[PDB]
Design a protein around this ligand. Sequence first.
Ligand SMILES: *[C@@H]1O[C@H](CO)[C@@H](O[C@@H]2O[C@H](CO)[C@@H](O[C@@H]3O[C@H](CO)[C@@H](O)[C@H](O)[C@@H]3O)[C@H](O)[C@H]2NC(C)=O)[C@H](O)[C@H]1NC(C)=O
Ligand SMILES: Nc1ncnc2c1ncn2[C@@H]1O[C@H](COP(=O)(O)OP(=O)(O)OP(=O)(O)O)[C@@H](O)[C@H]1O
Ligand SMILES: *[C@@H]1O[C@H](CO)[C@@H](O[C@@H]2O[C@H](CO)[C@@H](O)[C@H](O)[C@H]2NC(C)=O)[C@H](O)[C@H]1NC(C)=O
Ligand SMILES: [Cl-]
Ligand SMILES: [Cl-]
Ligand SMILES: [Cu+2]
Ligand SMILES: [Cu+2]
Ligand SMILES: [Cu+2]
Ligand SMILES: [Cu+2]
Length: 534
Amino acid sequence: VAQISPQYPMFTVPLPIPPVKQPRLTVTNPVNGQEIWYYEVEIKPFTHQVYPDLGSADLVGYDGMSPGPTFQVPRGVETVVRFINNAEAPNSVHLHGSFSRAAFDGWAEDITEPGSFKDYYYPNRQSARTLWYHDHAMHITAENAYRGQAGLYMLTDPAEDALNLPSGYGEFDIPMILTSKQYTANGNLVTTNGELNSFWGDVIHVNGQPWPFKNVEPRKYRFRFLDAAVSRSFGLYFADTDAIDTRLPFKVIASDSGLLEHPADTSLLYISMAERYEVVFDFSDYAGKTIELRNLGGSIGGIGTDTDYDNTDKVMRFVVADDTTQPDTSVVPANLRDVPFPSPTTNTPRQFRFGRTGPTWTINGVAFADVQNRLLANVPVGTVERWELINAGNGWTHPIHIHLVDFKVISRTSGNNARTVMPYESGLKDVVWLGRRETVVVEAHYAPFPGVYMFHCHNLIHEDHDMMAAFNATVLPDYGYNATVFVDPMEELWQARPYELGEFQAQSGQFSVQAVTERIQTMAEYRPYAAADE
Ligand SMILES: *[C@@H]1O[C@H](CO)[C@@H](O[C@@H]2O[C@H](CO)[C@@H](O[C@@H]3O[C@H](CO)[C@@H](O)[C@H](O)[C@@H]3O)[C@H](O)[C@H]2NC(C)=O)[C@H](O)[C@H]1NC(C)=O
Ligand SMILES: Nc1ncnc2c1ncn2[C@@H]1O[C@H](COP(=O)(O)OP(=O)(O)OP(=O)(O)O)[C@@H](O)[C@H]1O
Ligand SMILES: *[C@@H]1O[C@H](CO)[C@@H](O[C@@H]2O[C@H](CO)[C@@H](O)[C@H](O)[C@H]2NC(C)=O)[C@H](O)[C@H]1NC(C)=O
Ligand SMILES: [Cl-]
Ligand SMILES: [Cl-]
Ligand SMILES: [Cu+2]
Ligand SMILES: [Cu+2]
Ligand SMILES: [Cu+2]
Ligand SMILES: [Cu+2]
C-alpha cells in the first residue's frame, strides 16, 4: 500500500556501524581475584537528521545514539553496567540472550526513573551468541525501543574463533539491526503511543539508517541479523539487481542462543521481532554487481499479517568490488559445534494461548498488569519442560520470548498448512514465531538460576497491551547460593539509586573510582552466578 513517510533517497547513505562500547574501568573481584569490566551508559535525548532535506527526528538512546554502542565481551569476563537515566521517562534494561539473575534481567516493574541509575551484573558464561540490550519498562517498552533504546552485545569464545568464520567487527563481521518506522512530513518519528493492534512502519532501517548501501569485497561476510522492530516480521532474501526475483543462496550459521550444529543452506530467512540469525553471504560470484537485500511481500508470504508498503520489499544494497584487497582465508565448517540440547521429556506439555480478551492482548486470558493472575507456572530449577505456544488467530502473529532459558523448537503446526519447523530453527533459540494459526512446542531446561522471570510476545505493541506473564524457576530453602536475595526481581539491594548530574560528569561521589570499586566488590561477595561455575 502507498508509503506514508516522505520519499527517502534510496541506497545513498552508507550503513553505519555502532561503535564498540569501552569499559570506564575494571574492578578486582575479591571472590576470585579476576577483573570485572565496569561500564557507564547514559540514557539521553538527542536529535538525528534522518531525511537530509527535512527536520530532525527526536530519539532517546544508550549514550545518545541508536543503535546503542556495541558491547564485545569474552565468555568468562563478568560485566557490570550502570545504566543512567537522564531522559524524560523511566527505563528497565533487559540483556536478551543472558541468563541474568531475576533482578538484573530487566523485569518490567524494575524501573529506573530519571535522576536514577541501576547497576546490572551480567555473567557472560553462556555459549558465544549475538545478544542485544533493550528497554523493558512496564507499558512503555514499544516507545522506549522505537525511540532507540536497543544495542548489540556480542558474547565471544576463542573456540568459536578457531572455526575461522569471516571475522572483525566493522570488517567482515557486520551487525544488521533491522527496524521498521514511520516519519512525519517534517521528518520526525511518528509515535507508537496510542497504537494497540500493530505499528508496522513503512521505512526500513539497518543500524538506524533508512535503506542504506554498503561497498563490499567479493568474499564471505558474517551478517548478524537482529529484528529490533516494534511489529515488522521479515522474509529476507538477496537478489542481483539484474534479477531481483532470483534468490541467492547463503548459510545460516547461528540462531538466538548461538551456533547451529551445521550450517543451514538457505535462500529465504524468516526473522521476527527479537530473533537473531547469523548468516554467511559469499559475494565472490558477484564481483562487479549490486546485490539487493529484500523482504518477502504478501505479509511474509502468508505466514504473517504485516502491512506491506511501496518500499518494505527493500532493505539495503551491497555494491560488490571487482577484487579482494587480499585473499579471503575464512571458511564455514560443515560442523560448527555440539549444541547443548535439553534432555527430552515425556511429561505432558503446558499450554499458553496468545490471543485477545476484548481490547487487550493476553496469555491464557491474563494481562501482565493483573499481578494476581500473571504468574502462570512454577518450575523446579533443573526441570525440562515442553511449552505448547498456541496462536489460534488468523489476524495476529506472535514471536514468543521466554527469559532465562535457551529452547529447542520441537514442532510447528499451521491451520493454513503453510510450514512446519525451519532448518535454521534446528538449534537453540529464545524467541519462536507463531505465524497465522501456528502452534509451536518448545523444550527448555529451566536452569540454572532460581528467580521470577518474564515471558511474552515481542511484538512490542502486544507486549505493552498486555501479552506478558511470569514463571517462577523454584528451589527449596536448603538450596543456598544466596537464592533468598536473587529470586525477587524487585529486591531492595539491587534497586535503582538516585544520583546528581554533577556527580556523574565529574566522576565523584557514587561515580568515584573508590565508590564504584566498593559497590561492585560488595555485589561480587553475594556470588550471583556461582551455581553456573562448571
Ligand atoms: C518464587 O519462588 C521462590 C522459591 O524459589 C519463593 O520464595 C520463597 O518464599 C517463602 C515465603 O515467601 C520462603 O519461606 C519462608 O521462610 C521464612 C523463615 O525464614 C518464614 O517467614 C515463612 O513461613 C516461610 O517458611 C522461602 O524461603 C522462599 N525461598 C527462597 C529461596 O527465597 C518466592 O516467593 C516465589 N515468588 C513468587 C512471586 O511466587
Ligand atoms: N488484529 C486484530 N485485532 C483485533 N481483533 C482481531 C484482529 N484480527 C482478528 N480479530 C478478531 O478476533 C477474532 C478472531 O480472529 P481470527 O483471526 O481467529 O478470525 P477468523 O478468521 O474468524 O477465524 P475463526 O473462524 O477460527 O474464528 C474475530 O472476532 C476477529 O474479527
Ligand atoms: C552470600 O552473600 C553474602 C554477602 O556478601 C556472602 O557473605 C560473605 O562471605 C565471604 C566468604 O565466606 C566473607 O569473607 C564475607 O565477609 C561475607 N560477607 C557477609 C556480609 O557475610 C556469602 O558468602 C554468600 N553466600 C553464598 C553461599 O554465596
Ligand atoms: Cl497448561
Ligand atoms: Cl565460594
Ligand atoms: Cu528482547
Ligand atoms: Cu529476553
Ligand atoms: Cu503478539
Ligand atoms: Cu522480555
